Design a protein around this ligand. Sequence first.
Ligand code: P5S
Ligand code: PLX
Length: 507
Amino acid sequence: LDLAASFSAVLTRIQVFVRRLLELHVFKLVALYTVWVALKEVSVMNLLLVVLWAFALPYPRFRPMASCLSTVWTCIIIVCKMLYQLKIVNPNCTEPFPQPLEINQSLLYRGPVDPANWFGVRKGYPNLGYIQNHLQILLLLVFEAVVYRRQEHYRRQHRQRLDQDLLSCLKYFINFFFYKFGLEICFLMAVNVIGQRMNFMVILHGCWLVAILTRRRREAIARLWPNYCLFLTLFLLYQYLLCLGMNSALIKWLYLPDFFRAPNSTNLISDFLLLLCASQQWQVFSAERTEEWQRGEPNPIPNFIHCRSYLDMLKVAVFRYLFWLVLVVVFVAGATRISIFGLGYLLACFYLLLFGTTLLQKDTRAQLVLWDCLILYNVTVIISKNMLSLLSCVFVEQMQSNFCWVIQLFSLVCTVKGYYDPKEMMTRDRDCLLPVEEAGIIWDSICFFFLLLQRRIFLSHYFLHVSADLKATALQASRGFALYNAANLKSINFHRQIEEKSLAQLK
Ligand SMILES: CCCCCCCCCCCCCCCCCC(=O)OC[C@H](COP(=O)(O)OC[C@H](N)C(=O)O)OC(=O)CCCCCCCCCCCCCCCCC
Ligand SMILES: CCCCCCCCCCCCCCCCC[C@@H](O)O[C@H](CO[C@H](O)CCCCCCCCCCCCCCC)COP(=O)(O)OCC[N+](C)(C)C
């Protein structure tokens, strides 16, 4: 029974660790699922719930009452939906003759609505699965309460060690992965929403992201973070209100409310994720975890290169052999997407490949200057692609069959589903050969991720010791040459002796 006892002990340890996982994620799941349902089913009640949650995430003091109100509102919604499911209600559609004009199925005119249009209409056909979503939300809230109660019961009843082993470093990252990486993660979330939407709203996001980048010292970020969080929550609320209540495609492009085409609300969830990260990062950014906190001698562990441990080998791989991987990724991103923006990628890759050694020899100042130049170019191309996404709506009307070179040059094509689709235009041959697989964003984003990671490496002391090693190698090269000459001389003497002996034997 010793094996059974060991399994029971492992299960108890896993359960003890869990409560900790539930504290960070339980909150993330409750904020995320309600917003997902609210965007899935637009409603006035959903709008109120979303607004309350949106305010709750950036500010902690509003969390208690918001959590209290969540279950009340969800119970109210469930009860009122079951009440209106009895269909005891028993309830102008004037089509235009010839300002917005359309011919296909709409919602104002071409369909009968039992309320007016400005409020979401709820009717339960199945009457069982049509109210399941709110029930699931209530169940999740109950689970969260149960978790808190269990924690209360366990309250009443019942880093410097990183470098020794790889498992210790793994534990440290699991504990504080977000502590030192939150800023980069929220930057990546911003580019994620920008790539996903390709609307006018994400143009606003990108302009604000460049404003964040240009103040690259972290104290300016400290000054400007609360304003960004307030802007983000107000913007999300505004977008939800706009969703609830001239070519058709162009109208779609700008985020606006049209009965015939309604801007997708599923995409918004991605924007919400960005706010969550920013809000979470902000509390950490403010908190610093100061209650934990977990050139003579600023480098306690200079000797990664020697490699006495497994973690040392992984460390040297990260701090020494990742710059060239960055260069390879830059080249791949430039070459795979044949638009004229990867030509800049190719040129940058060539120059960096040629001068990487002397760049590493340089002090951090010029290195970060050039690296910031590269990152700025990358974000510029991503913003330019999102801006030229406007040439996806007023595209068929003009660009096709005229100014074809323009489209081939900048690789104009739509990648979002909120338009017609790729791989259909080629059916008609308008003598333009639309590049369908060409335009994309994932490679630019991944290059952005690698650039930020390398920039972080440059700031770290570890690179500084590696640079010292590079200086030493640059000094040695001449001695290496002389040793090579000595080896060649020894070999040639050996061969001469063997040949002479053979000739003597022949004689
Ligand atoms: C099926 C699909 C699978 C897909 C898998 C994908 C896997 C992706 C993995 C991505 C890993 C990315 C690792 C990034 C590590 C960044 C390290 C880094 O930036 O360190 C730098 C920082 C420096 O400290 P600071 O507090 O900033 O210093 C104060 C500052 N300088 C000041 O003056 O104010 O912080 C530090 O110095 C901390 C140093 C930590 C060293 C940790 C080394 C980790 C090595 C990881 C190796 C991974 C190997 C994986 C092998 C897999 C094989 C199958
Ligand atoms: C290598 C940069 C890659 C990203 C940007 C360009 C990508 C394509 C072209 C790549 C050419 C690389 C070879 C040219 C390198 C010149 C040397 C480089 O180090 O210049 C440094 C920095 O020069 C700049 O990086 C010039 C970069 C040229 C391209 C800038 C592109 C920026 C984004 C917008 C592009 C818009 C194109 C047009 C759109 C309509 C200056 O060195 P240093 O004297 O030690 O530092 C001075 C710091 N000061 C100024 C504060 C005193």
